[PDB]
Design an enzyme around this catalytic site. Structure first.
Site, short mmCIF file in Angstrom:
data_model
loop_
_atom_site.label_atom_id
_atom_site.label_comp_id
_atom_site.label_asym_id
_atom_site.label_seq_id
_atom_site.Cartn_x
_atom_site.Cartn_y
_atom_site.Cartn_z
N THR A 1 0.85 -1.23 0.00
CA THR A 1 0.00 0.00 0.00
C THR A 1 0.87 1.26 0.00
OG1 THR A 1 -1.72 -1.18 1.25
CG2 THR A 1 -1.90 1.23 1.14
N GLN A 2 0.69 2.08 -1.03
CA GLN A 2 1.39 3.36 -1.14
C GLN A 2 0.55 4.47 -0.52
OE1 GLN A 2 4.58 3.15 -2.36
NE2 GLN A 2 4.08 0.98 -2.66
N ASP B 1 -5.79 -3.48 4.72
CA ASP B 1 -4.56 -4.21 5.04
C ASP B 1 -4.73 -5.04 6.31
OD1 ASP B 1 -3.25 -3.23 2.77
OD2 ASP B 1 -2.19 -1.65 3.84
#
Ligand SMILES: *[C@@](C)(CO)[C@](*)(O)[C@H](Cc1ccccc1)NC(=O)[C@H](Cc1ccc(OC)cc1)NC(=O)[C@H](C)NC(=O)CN1CCOCC1
Ligand SMILES: *[C@@](C)(CO)[C@](*)(O)[C@H](Cc1ccccc1)NC(=O)[C@H](Cc1ccc(OC)cc1)NC(=O)[C@H](C)NC(=O)CN1CCOCC1
Lengths: 220, 244, 216, 233, 202, 213, 204, 238
Positions: free
Chosen positions: C1-2, C59
């Site tokens: 995840t950015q 997440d």
């Protein structure tokens, strides 16, 4: 470009201008923008010209391979799926805006396909840089289940509006009419623009250019 | 079943009468191993296995032929125990992949189909040999009820009310046809499973044996569990009492 | 995840005489918008250990699925061995650092609580793989607001009863609701004990607003 | 006709067993481990006076503290010796220390059964190595001698012979060898036993001798060095 | 976009606007954002037109094969799980805000939200798209526990009309779909049919 | 985008004597302007003869320690002996250089006994550059500890002092004093000081409290 | 501009039963001229020529790789290549490098084998075919070449009329371009003969 | 006779000869004994001299702080398998920081040893191991075969003439649990003694002992380390 499509009573009308540009200069005054996919499906193309040509030829090739295997006339949905799934896979890097139209065993179908791989199914679609001008005509004059000659007039007027209003569009109006039993590929349907006659003579006469070296090679 | 100038050397080779002997010889492996049974009751499934002890030096619990594939699925094996364990691992992984993709406990019939497709894949080539193992799969759900399946070395999958695999499979099936399993509670079945095993066991030719029992049903809240020592020992007492 | 999307704010934890207590509000914020007002950000790992997660909820749902399966896989064998709270903590440090090193981090900050063999466990895990043990833990704004209060009490009294630890958390969750703009006055209390892991339903902290009238 | 990984009904691998038979065709080699060092001897077995004896090297150094004598299909040893040389230098690079004689032997022994047909790499070994090796060296545990065979089994030896005449040489060592003899006695004993079993007459050209000792590095004996020990009839 | 799904007793009610934008130009003023995946399972699409479409087409393929192989009418949760997997794995590449709503014989009417991150949560009602911002207050004030099917249709139509009124990237036509055990029924609202809340100023 | 590093503070110190080696570190773990924990000793034992101290990005310090321990057993299995201090120092250099283009944000100091029982200290940079020295500091406060040691242990810049051999007592006092001095100026240093002492018989630990602010 | 690095100018023109192709002769790196006798027009088989304008490397690289496929074609087939077939071969070649193109815009001129019919086309750097019945241009003086051709070209010109027109067009367009010039070579293609000439031109 | 060349060939009897021939290697190897109590697990191994002038070949190997193995069969296959066991142990401590449970390691061997017995051009692992370990469930003695089958044992002996060692362990198995470490080892090497021909007995040269348990980690006793256990030589009767 300006490209447009319409669904009428008997089938589909597709339209296109004939201007190609490199930078802000006209490269081709008469280029073919309505492309053969199958004997019953044709596809208009806008954006990156080379992308337009190769994408439209690959799918045409893949449909012939498909229609030979099935022994059946190819469907506009298959043309739609093939074009959609490719253009998406290339994340919009293949700059092809498309107007897909044809007649099936299912009937008359019209699609607009975007470079990113998004499709719309509509009675009338416009693509290209002259799309707004062409879409304006449709919103104002389009009627459901119109006659062939009437639909020919409508699409041509839409293309004309793109030609006389969008700097990226010009020259001839091309049409393609597809019905349940007939296909008319009308190349120069209308020639609304012509070069003014050169009434001054500038023909450079024989011996007006100085030559330094000459070699003549004979052939068969 | 005879001709073997080739034909029976590879699983990728048919015999002139249209048979794959390598699969049939793989089935012979399960025929030589000790018997394992499973019975589908009204509220679950009970498994029973005669575990032959080769030496008294092995701990009670060694060579366990009962397996937990998923928290709700049980597995009883017969044949080559090495292949049995690797097939259990495949079943484990298939069951966990389903949960990781779809968020719920894998339905038994789907798990049985998936595993059987894997079993079948080992019957088609010269590069690999078929599994020398037959296995049963049991599960109970409130929405699906009691379910029992059996897969043989060929990759064939069927649902059963009662099933036997091993040395005395035909001898065991005649005893299970005597039971009314559709109306029976899985508490009563344990007793009957133990009886069938003791009857089928060869006292003189084979040595001493350990009885392994597991169940999954209403009584065990849908979870596949080993039958408690106090209930197992009760059934062994009862099975020996049947030998009047 | 950015780029995190739906995120959870503070997660609290303090160990007492008997086990560990963990707290987290039930909000999933989408930027400044409080979009999902009823989500559980605490999970039960096994009988001896639990987890609360800050940051990206999607997440967290991934880690919940992976740990979920790991516990299932152990209980299949029935060999009498199960993951200790320290083991899950160790595993999570390995997972988070692995993803950090791949330059694709799991956008999370965890608090692991557990009770095993008499002593109680409390561990912290970054999205970078920074892990340590502590008698009291707080993530996000909790670190700046709750942890100071948690440390002050433990200075005076190192060992706490379940009641004293529970009402301390009540006090910490009250401050967080006053000062953190990404929190929500609806939380869960998770508790590890000898009996097991209990998560309690929707809870609200009582608030005072008397200071409104005393401005002039 | 079967695969290279096929077990005999006795529990041995055919190819590995036949690879041992290849040693019985190789030139004989003796290694003796003593308190003062390790010596390695081997017969060269020259077939033509036109052949240069200095080019036949059956004893090679792996490092300054490790030497290796070989018997059998000499061509096969090329890789085994090279791999041993790379291992010693890799160890120095990483750990700043010399590898123990046992460690090197073990590293080479790992390569012995690395052969097969199906499920192989783009260059995997098709068969075992047809060589026996004697590793003589000195480390912290004093001086040791190790013997590896095609099977992969490596073991420390006080005195070992490998080759075509390892039958009579091994029994001859069990008579002469005392576990507290000197290195001079060891060199004397080995050369005596070597000339007993050789077809050709023993001189300072048809044999090779090397010593490694706690005092000094791997030393290859020159013609003159050999003359000094050969003179004892 | 604006998209919405409300769960009632015997099934679900879905609603969407019809506007597709390419910048500030409406490329398609009458879009069917309600995509059928199976017999009783639908999804509402918001975000990237090409992205959501491709995911939808992949879930249809995946669930199609799964259902036949399992021999059951597909679970709504299962269809939502197939969306989650794709929306989570490729979260950095896609711009998709999906609402999966449908019916199955095991759990009845279900509404699942899959926002841009790739998380999944079941809700009584869900709203998404750029236009959903302007209707959070109304939707929270109006929603009542245990609404009938006909009330849920009115509830979605009202919320969407208010959203299309304010949001520039929403408008056109309200498309409604009702799914229950008996099947799927669709209706379309045009001009006058859209609930008028009059222009409220001096 | 996203930073894969965090500065967590911490300082490690090591002094080599004749028959001993001292590895000392503060116990504070920080991030930004707040403290993670007051109980985080950076010095860690590897064998009976070797102790390592790691400072910097704790994520890397934890990982790197777990790599070293694994490698210690790998060496033990293969070579049938415990790894020597010099061999550990040489190996760490290769482990750190393996990540040359994605560096461990890490300052290591190894302390222990060499093969003759004398005190040995090895100092490292983030990418594996290392040497043997008599005393070294590494971390957020290394610039504060070093100059005093260079003066007192190294007898530098003083005119007439006969170089008296280091005693265990004097080195222990010196260690305690520099950290107390560091806690006054460096914000990352404080709470408590952990000291590891390596001698003939195992490893000993001692703990002195520091400023908590 | 990437195309302006080496400069260059290529032109083709239709006659009666003939076809002309002209190019400038300068090879330069930016401001500096290096070579005055640089080749840009290449034979593809008796009555078929390709002219390449753009980056000097790719100008060479494409010609060399096009000839590779041409020779394999002419050996597999028992025939010379048709002008339409070569155009499609160029388009294929250049489009294979769609996302890493050769910086050259080709111009093809030739007569059709058997039917000796004139043919002219120009292409993209990514290979988009464009056929015309009058003229095609490519180069740094694209605009200058257009102005001349639109005002000089006549419908039915004989080989000599055609020569004079392409010569004047190439010559005067080049004279308004800094990076194009240093001589002009012209190829005129008839059924029975080919006339190659270099013109008297400014060298500044 | 035509089914014994590959592992992928089933015989008409439902047997695989290549797996059965691989098991012969275990019998051809030197005998070893493994037994456990309530607290300790002891491995005793008989070393072989290739030509009594070379050292007695190694038999007991380290795996982890709590697991050690005794080998019978092919040495090169033993080391290959041992490296796998070492790797899985190191993996567990890296990820979970806890010792890998013995049972779980043994079942990982059962899966790895199976793979080759089912692919063409592959062969079984020609080695049988006796695994001694200690974990949360106490001491363990496990046996692996060339067939990927494994066994949980009260006591076990494998190798040449291991039948006589097995019958001694049969007789004295009721005494192993409550018995102490010093007596366990005595029982272990007394079984190993029974394998030896009546002429030769146990010496400091030919005996190797591995011990793991509650208080101590896995330790190998070889030459002079083995003499405290031999001191108390009960002498052999027959
Ligand atoms: C109208 C004319 C655009 O205003 C149409 O979209 C038309 C489509 C067409 C024309 C001829 C044959 C088939 C279809 N498009 C063009 O004429 C097109 C315009 C364009 C230029 C650059 C672009 O940036 C990516 C996108 C579109 N013209 C061309 O393709 C010209 C001949 N070639 C180039 O400009 C070369 N480009 C291609 C893309 O990469 C950079 C170099
Ligand atoms: C409302 C209208 C706007 O938020 C909806 O979300 C709608 C979703 C929809 C549309 C058609 C069918 C089903 C559902 N969104 C759009 O209409 C969408 C707006 C958008 C553009 C780009 C995005 O980034 C990836 C995200 C949202 N419009 C389109 O997808 C149109 C057809 N295509 C383009 O705008 C072309 N773009 C692609 C991205 O790069 C720039 C050019």
């Amino acid at each position: 470009t300006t490209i447009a499509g319409v669904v009428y009573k008997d089938g589909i009308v597709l339209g296109a201008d004939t201007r190609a540009t490199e930078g802000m200069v006209v490269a081709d005054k008469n280029c073919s923008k309505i492309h053969f996919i199958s004997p019953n499906i044709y596809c208009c193309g806008a954006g990156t010209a080379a992308d337009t040509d190769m994408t439209t030829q690959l799918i045409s090739s893949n449909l012939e391979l498909h229609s030979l295997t099935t022994g059946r006339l190819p469907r506009v949905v298959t043309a739609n799926r093939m074009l959609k799934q490719m253009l998406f896979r290339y994340q919009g890097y293949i700059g092809a805006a498309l107007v897909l139209g044809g007649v099936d065993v299912t009937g008359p179908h019209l699609y607009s396909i975007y470079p990113h791989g998004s499709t719309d199914k509509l009675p009338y679609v416009t693509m290209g840089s002259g799309s707004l001008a062409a879409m304006a005509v449709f919103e104002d004059k389009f009627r459901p289940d119109m006659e062939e000659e009437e639909a020919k007039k409508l699409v041509s007027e839409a293309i004309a509006a793109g030609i006389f209003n969008d700097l990226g569009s010009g020259s001839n109006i091309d049409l393609c009419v597809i019905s349940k039993s007939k296909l008319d590929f009308l190349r120069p349907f209308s020639v609304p623009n012509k070069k003014g006659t050169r009434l001054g003579r500038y023909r450079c006469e024989k011996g007006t250019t100085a030559v330094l070296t000459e070699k003549v090679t004979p052939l068969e | 079943s005879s001709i073997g100038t080739g034909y029976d050397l590879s699983a990728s080779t048919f015999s002139p009468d249209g048979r794959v002997f390598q699969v049939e010889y793989a089935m012979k492996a399960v025929e030589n191993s000790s018997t394992a049974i499973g019975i589908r009751c009204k509220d679950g499934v009970v498994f029973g296995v005669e575990k032959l002890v080769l030496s008294k030096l092995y701990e009670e619990g060694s060579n366990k032929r009962l397996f937990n594939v998923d928290r709700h699925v049980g597995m009883a094996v017969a044949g080559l125990l090495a292949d049995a364990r690797s097939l259990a691992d495949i079943a484990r992984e298939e069951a966990s992949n389903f949960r990781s993709n779809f968020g719920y406990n894998i339905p038994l019939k789907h798990l049985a189909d998936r595993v059987a497709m894997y079993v079948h894949a080992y019957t088609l080539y010269s590069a690999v040999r078929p599994f020398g193992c037959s296995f049963m799969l049991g599960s109970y759900s409130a929405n699906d009820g009691a379910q029992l399946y059996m897969i043989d070395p060929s990759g064939v999958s069927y649902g059963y009310w009662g099933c036997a695999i091993g040395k005395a499979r035909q001898a065991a099936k005649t005893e299970i046809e005597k039971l009314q399993m559709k109306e029976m509670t899985c508490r009563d079945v344990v007793k009957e499973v133990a009886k069938i095993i003791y009857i089928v066991h060869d006292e003189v030719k084979d040595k001493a044996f350990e009885l392994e029992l597991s169940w999954v049903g209403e009584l065990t809240k849908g979870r596949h569990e080993i039958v408690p020592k106090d209930i197992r020992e009760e059934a062994e007492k009862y099975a020996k009492e049947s030998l009047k | 995840t950015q780029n995190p999307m739906v995120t959870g704010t503070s997660v609290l934890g303090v160990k007492f005489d008997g086990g560990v207590v963990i707290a987290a509000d039930m909000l999933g914020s989408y930027g400044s918008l409080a979009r999902f007002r009823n989500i559980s950000r605490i999970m039960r790992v096994n009988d001896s250990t639990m987890l609360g997660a800050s940051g990206d909820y999607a997440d967290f749902q991934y880690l919940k699925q992976v740990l979920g399966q790991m516990v299932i896989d152990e209980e299949l064998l029935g060999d009498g061995h199960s993951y200790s709270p320290r083991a899950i903590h160790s595993w999570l440090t390995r997972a988070m650092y692995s993803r950090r090193s791949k330059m694709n981090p799991l956008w999370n900050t965890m608090v692991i609580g557990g009770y095993a063999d008499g002593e109680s466990f409390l561990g912290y895990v970054d999205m970078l793989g920074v892990a340590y043990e502590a008698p009291s833990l707080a993530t996000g704004y909790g670190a700046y607001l709750a942890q100071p209060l948690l440390r002050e009490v433990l200075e005076k009294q190192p060992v706490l009863s379940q009641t004293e630890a529970r009402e301390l958390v009540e006090r910490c969750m009250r401050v967080l609701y006053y000062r953190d703009a990404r929190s929500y006055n609806r939380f869960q209390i998770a508790t590890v004990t000898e009996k097991g892991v209990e998560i309690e339903g929707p809870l609200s902290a009582q608030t005072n607003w008397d200071i409104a009238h005393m401005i002039s | 006709d079967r695969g290279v990984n096929t077990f005999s009904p006795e529990g041995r691998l055919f190819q590995v067993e036949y690879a041992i038979e290849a040693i019985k065709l190789g030139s004989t080699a003796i290694g003796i481990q003593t308190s003062e060092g390790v010596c390695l001897a081997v017969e060269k077995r020259i077939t033509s006076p036109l052949m240069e004896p200095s080019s036949i090297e059956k004893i090679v150094e792996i490092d300054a503290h490790i030497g290796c004598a070989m018997s059998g299909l000499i061509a096969d040893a090329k890789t085994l010796i090279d791999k041993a040389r790379v291992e010693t230098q890799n160890h120095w690079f990483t750990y700043n220390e010399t590898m123990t004689v046992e460690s090197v032997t073990q590293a080479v022994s790992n390569l012995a059964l690395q052969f097969g047909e199906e499920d192989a790499d783009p260059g995997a070994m098709s068969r075992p190595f047809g060589v026996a090796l004697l590793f003589g060296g000195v480390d912290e545990k004093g001086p040791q001698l190790f013997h590896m065979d095609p099977s992969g089994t490596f073991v420390q030896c006080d005195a070992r012979a490998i080759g075509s005449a390892s039958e009579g040489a091994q029994s001859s060592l069990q008579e002469v060898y005392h576990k507290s003899m000197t290195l001079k006695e060891a060199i004397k004993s080995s050369l005596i036993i070597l000339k007993q079993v050789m077809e050709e007459k023993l001189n300072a050209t048809n044999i090779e001798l090397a010593t490694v000792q706690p005092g000094q590095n791997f030393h290859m004996f020159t013609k003159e060095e050999l003359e000094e020990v050969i003179k004892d009839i | 976009t604006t998209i919405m799904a409300v769960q009632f007793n015997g099934g679900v009610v879905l609603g969407a606007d019809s506007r597709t934008t390419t910048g500030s130009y409406i490329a398609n003023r009458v879009t069917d954002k309600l995509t059928p995946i199976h017999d009783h399972i639908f999804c509402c699409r918001s975000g990237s037109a090409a992205d959501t479409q491709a995911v939808a087409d992949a879930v249809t393929y995946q669930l199609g094969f799964h259902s036949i192989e399992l021999n059951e009418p597909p679970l709504v949760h299962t269809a939502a799980s197939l969306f989650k997997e794709m929306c989570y794995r490729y979260r950095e590449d896609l711009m998709a805000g999906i609402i999966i709503a449908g019916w199955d014989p095991q759990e009845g009417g279900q509404v699942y939200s899959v926002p841009m991150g790739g998380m999944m949560v079941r809700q009584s009602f869900a709203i998404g798209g750029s236009g959903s911002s302007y209707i959070y207050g109304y939707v929270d004030a109006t929603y009542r526990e245990g609404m009938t099917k006909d009330e849920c249709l009115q509830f979605t139509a009202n919320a969407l009309a208010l959203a299309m009124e304010r949001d520039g990237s929403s408008g056109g036509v309200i498309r409604l779909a009702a799914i229950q055990e008996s099947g799927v029924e669709r209706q379309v609202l045009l001009g006058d049919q859209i609930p008028k809340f009059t222009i409220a100023t001096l | 985008r996203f930073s894969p590093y965090a500065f967590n503070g911490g300082t490690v110190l090591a002094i080599a004597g004749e028959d001993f080696s001292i590895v000392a570190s503060d116990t504070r773990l920080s991030e930004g302007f707040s403290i993670h924990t007051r109980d985080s000793p950076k010095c860690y034992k590897l064998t009976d003869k070797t102790v390592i101290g790691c400072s910097g990005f704790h994520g890397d310090c934890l990982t790197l320690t777990k790599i070293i321990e694994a490698r210690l057993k790998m060496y033990k299995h293969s070579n049938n002996k415990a790894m020597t201090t010099g061999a550990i120092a040489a190996m760490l250099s290769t482990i750190l250089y393996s990540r040359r283009f994605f560096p461990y944000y890490v300052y290591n100091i190894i302390g222990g006994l060499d093969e003759e029982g004398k005190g040995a200290v090895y100092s490292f940079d983030p990418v594996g550059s290392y040497q043997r020295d008599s005393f070294k500091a590494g971390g957020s406060a290394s610039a504060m500890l070093q100059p005093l040691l260079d003066n007192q242990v190294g007898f530098k810049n003083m005119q007439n002092v006969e170089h008296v051999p280091l005693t265990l007592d004097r080195a222990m006092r010196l260690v305690k004093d520099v950290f107390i001095s560091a806690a006054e100026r460096d914000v990352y240093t404080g709470d408590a000081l952990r000291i590891c002492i390596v001698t003939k018989e195992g490893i000993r630990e001692e703990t002195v409290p520091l400023r908590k602010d | 501009s990437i195309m302006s690095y080496n400069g260059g100018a290529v032109m083709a023109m239709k006659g009666k039963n003939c076809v002309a192709i002209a190019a400038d002769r300068r090879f330069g790196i930016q401001a500096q001229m290096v070579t005055t006798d640089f080749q840009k027009i290449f034979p593809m088989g008796d009555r078929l020529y390709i002219g390449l304008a753009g980056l000097a490397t790719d100008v060479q690289t494409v010609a060399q790789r096009l000839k590779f496929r041409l020779n394999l074609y002419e050996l597999k087939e028992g025939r010379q290549i048709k002008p339409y077939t070569l155009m499609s071969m160029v388009a294929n070649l250049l489009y294979e490098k769609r996302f890493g193109p050769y910086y050259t815009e080709p111009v093809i001129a030739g007569l059709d084998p058997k039917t000796f019919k004139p043919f002219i086309c120009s292409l993209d750097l990514i290979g988009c075919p464009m056929v015309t019945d009058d003229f095609v241009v490519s180069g740094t003086c694209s605009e200058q070449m257009y102005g001349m051709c639109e005002s000089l070209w006549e419908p039915n010109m004989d080989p000599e009329h055609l020569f004079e027109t392409i010569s004047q067009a190439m010559l005067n367009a080049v004279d308004r371009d800094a990076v194009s010039g240093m001589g002009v070579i012209v190829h005129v293609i008839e059924k029975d003969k080919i006339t190659t000439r270099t013109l008297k031109a400014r060298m500044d | 006779n035509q089914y014994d060349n590959d592992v992928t060939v089933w015989s008409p009897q439902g047997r695989i000869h290549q797996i059965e021939y691989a098991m012969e290697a275990v019998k051809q190897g030197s005998a070893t004994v493994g037994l456990k109590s309530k607290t300790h697990a002891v491995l005793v191994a008989l070393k072989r001299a290739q030509s009594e002038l070379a050292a007695h070949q190694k038999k007991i190997l380290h795996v982890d702080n709590h697991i050690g193995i005794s080998i019978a069969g092919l040495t090169a296959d033993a080391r290959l398998l041992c490296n796998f066991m070492r790797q899985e142990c190191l993996d567990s401590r890296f990820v979970f920081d806890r010792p890998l449970p013995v049972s779980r390691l043994v079942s990982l061997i059962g899966s790895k040893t199976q793979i080759p017995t089912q692919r063409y051009g592959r062969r079984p692992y020609g080695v049988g191991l006796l695994i001694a370990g200690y974990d949360d469930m106490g001491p363990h003695i496990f046996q692996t075969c060339p067939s990927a089958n494994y066994f949980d044992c009260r006591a076990m002996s494998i190798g040449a003439r291991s039948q006589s060692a097995r019958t001694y362990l049969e007789r004295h198995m009721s005494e192993f649990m409550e018995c102490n470490l010093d007596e366990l080892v005595k029982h272990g090497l007394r079984a190993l003694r029974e394998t030896l021909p009546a002429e030769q007995d146990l010496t400091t040269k030919n005996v190797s002992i591995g011990i793991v348990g509650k208080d101590l980690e896995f330790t190998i006793y070889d030459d002079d380390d083995v003499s405290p256990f031999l001191d108390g030589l009960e002498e052999r009767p027959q």
